[PDB]
């Protein structure tokens, strides 16, 4: 039971670590989308390729 | 070693997701280089007059 507990605990910790890294990436993309909503939609942008 | 492979089979799918993570990083590096440098559609050239 201790061997099974250690294995399943390691699997759950690995899943939480990948979820945290993907959450950081999704938060960066959401910050970019919020900036594009503020500048593209609510105004007119002079930035090239933005 | 065959015996080590046989007992490594009992640990599940850790190396599949390690390989998936490293493959994602490898694709991401080429994506980074392509988004930085390949921004122009055509290959312009300088005239021979300088």
From Swiss-Prot, chain B:
Top-level taxon: Viruses
Function in brief: Precursor of the fusion protein processed in the biosynthesis of the S protein and the formation of virus particle. Mediates fusion of the virion and cellular membranes by functioning as a class I viral fusion protein. Contains two viral fusion peptides that are unmasked after cleavage. The S2/S2' cleavage occurs during virus entry at the cell membrane by host TMPRSS2 or during endocytosis by host CSTL.
Name of the protein this chain belongs to: Spike protein S2
Organism whose genome encodes this protein: Severe acute respiratory syndrome coronavirus 2
Lineage, broadest ranks: Viruses, Riboviria, Orthornavirae, Pisuviricota, Pisoniviricetes
Underlying gene: S
Portion held of the full protein: 746 to 795 of 1273
